[PDB]
Ligand binder design. Structure first.
Ligand SMILES: COc1ccccc1NC(N)=S
Ligand SMILES: COc1ccccc1NC(N)=S
Ligand SMILES: COc1ccccc1NC(N)=S
Ligand SMILES: [Zn+2]
Length: 140
């Protein structure tokens, strides 16, 4: 689990979105595994606006943060999970690292702020759903 809190937006994995999230939906994209919902309070997080390929991610299944190098957001043929079938998951970044379902929502961060959240795993890779292209998260 885990979320990003930027202004009056809450950013979660679409597959972990709550009823409250769907009842307060701002935007969702199955292809990206992202959902954003409205919030009443303001949030602690700044979104990275950058093309960094190095950062640090939180892995709940290790209670550890790991420094990683990661690929630029791509369309990545992700194998079936319990939430999605095998297709092109878009805006996905891959790194060599451990990942489990309960790790989805872990933050990846660079010097410019939050880059994305854990979305995929398996075979010694971790995939992150990028949020740095969602410029609208910074206003209104
Ligand atoms: C690797 O993360 C950082 C490094 C230096 C400054 C800021 C950050 N990012 C956040 N605190 S979200
Ligand atoms: C980080 O999540 C995964 C790890 C391994 C395989 C699949 C997934 N995706 C899920 N949504 S549970
Ligand atoms: C061995 O840990 C898992 C268990 C089930 C699904 C995915 C994982 N994670 C990796 N293989 S990175
Ligand atoms: Zn950066």
């Amino acid at each position: 689990s885990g979320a990003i809190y930027v202004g009056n937006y809450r950013v979660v994995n679409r597959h972990l979105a709550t009823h409250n999230d769907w009842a307060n939906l701002v935007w969702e994209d199955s292809s990206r595994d992202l959902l954003v919902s409205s919030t009443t309070a303001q949030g602690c997080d700044t979104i990275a606006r950058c093309d960094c390929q190095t950062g640090v991610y939180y892995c709940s299944s290790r209670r550890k943060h790991y420094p990683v190098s990661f690929s630029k957001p791509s369309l990545i043929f992700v194998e079936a999970s319990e939430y999605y079938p095998a297709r092109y998951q878009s805006h996905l970044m891959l790194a060599v690292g451990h990942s489990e379902p309960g790790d989805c929502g872990g933050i990846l961060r660079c010097q410019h702020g939050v880059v994305g959240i854990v979305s995929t795993g398996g075979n010694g890779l971790v995939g992150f759903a990028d949020v740095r292209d969602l410029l609208w998260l910074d206003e209104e």
